[PDB]
């Protein structure tokens, strides 16, 4: 299959300023009859993709003048002359020169803002949950920017792997931050084998990693 690679994975933008994103194919998208079937779409959360540019550089009917595509062969670029709020979302490229038709992985446009360190909170499992035989330990990272953030679980100072899951919110409409939840899931029996539970957080806004912790049973 033809591999479509988009970069960056996410692009911080500012209203009224230009933007540029790239799409590269593992081989030329020139079709045997001359046309290059490379297209660009915009998708907003919960919504279907909308065609912006078809065949490299043609603006689809209804698309603002500030959008424009270019490139050839294996390298393609979508440009926005002046980013508007309505342009925020995930941009995709696709090709249907070669079978199977394939999509790039997407490039998100997010609002740029000043660095904001997360507020960090750790929550032990409730006694209610424990009676049922499972222990969920939750670490919250509240209202931070940029998105990049590392959360590490330590149980009696032993780094954990392979037993946690993370979820993140969409960028906030008011303050342009992200929030993140990390859940460490253990059986009651495993939970009771250890005393100290900690989440260690690393972020651009923190001059040193922040650790929040508790000892099993206290409080």
């Amino acid at each position: 299959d033809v591999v479509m690679t988009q970069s960056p994975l996410s692009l911080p933008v500012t209203l009224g300023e230009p933007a540029s994103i790239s799409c590269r194919s593992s081989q030329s998208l020139v079709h045997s009859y001359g046309d290059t079937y490379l297209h660009w779409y915009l998708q907003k959360p919960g919504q279907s993709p909308k065609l912006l540019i078809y065949k490299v550089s043609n603006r689809f009917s209804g698309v603002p003048d500030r959008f424009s595509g270019s490139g050839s062969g294996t390298d393609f670029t979508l440009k926005i002359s002046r980013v508007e709020t309505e342009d925020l979302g995930v941009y995709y490229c696709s090709q249907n020169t070669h079978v199977p038709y394939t999509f790039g992985g997407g490039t998100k446009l997010e609002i740029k803002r000043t660095v904001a360190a997360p507020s960090v909170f750790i929550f032990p499992p409730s006694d209610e949950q424990l009676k049922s035989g499972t222990a969920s330990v939750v670490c919250l990272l509240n209202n931070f920017y940029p998105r990049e953030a590392k959360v590490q679980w330590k149980v009696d100072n032993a780094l954990q792997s392979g037993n946690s899951q993370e979820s993140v919110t969409e960028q906030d409409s008011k303050d342009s931050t992200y929030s993140l939840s990390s859940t460490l899931t253990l059986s009651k029996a495993d939970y009771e084998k250890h005393k100290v539970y900690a989440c260690e957080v690393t972020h651009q806004g923190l001059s040193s990693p922040v650790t929040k912790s508790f000892n099993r049973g206290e409080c």
């Binding site: 919504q47 279907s48 696709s94 249907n96 199977p100 032990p124 899951q165 979820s167």
Partner: protein, 220 residues
Amino acid sequence: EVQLQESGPGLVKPSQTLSLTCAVSGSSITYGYHWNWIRQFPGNKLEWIGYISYDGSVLYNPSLENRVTITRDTSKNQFFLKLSSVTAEDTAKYYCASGFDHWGQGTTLTVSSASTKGPSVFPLAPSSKSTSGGTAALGCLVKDYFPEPVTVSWNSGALTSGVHTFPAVLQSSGLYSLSSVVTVPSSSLGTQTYICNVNHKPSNTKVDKKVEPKSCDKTH
């Protein structure tokens, strides 16, 4: 301009055959279009499935060709996707499209052997070390439900500032889990009441959970 509307079963079990319908308006499927099926996985990756042409000609993604059948009914201006031997990995949002020019709103499809189950709701208790005169966090863990979705509000909708409700994760158990948190003034704890309202319509479950600090005395 062509309009497309997907319909599907919402939920199917592994090994079964998925059948989707695309109803087309504003244009006839016997005209020069490639009537495409495309799907979008959780994680947002897009995959082209196949198309059927004005003359009934079909083309499929080779990775799916053994399980895929696209058909049509020109008399009611519809076309169909049949996907056999489905597994959990076929869970996705399925789109039909006129070429790639116009897409329908899509139909969400889940493949799972899980049974309908209402959530357990556990407190994410405010820490008794919350910074005095500062900000505290509390929440509700909404665990082990199926299928999606649940809704979560705070204080019957009266509390919206500072709320973050996270997207659900699918656990290895085949059940979903999510958390909803809120930040509030530390000085409000014990004077204000905080209740998360959790609704899971598929199981007709409604749960209101008051979130309180945990007892910190050794003797209580």
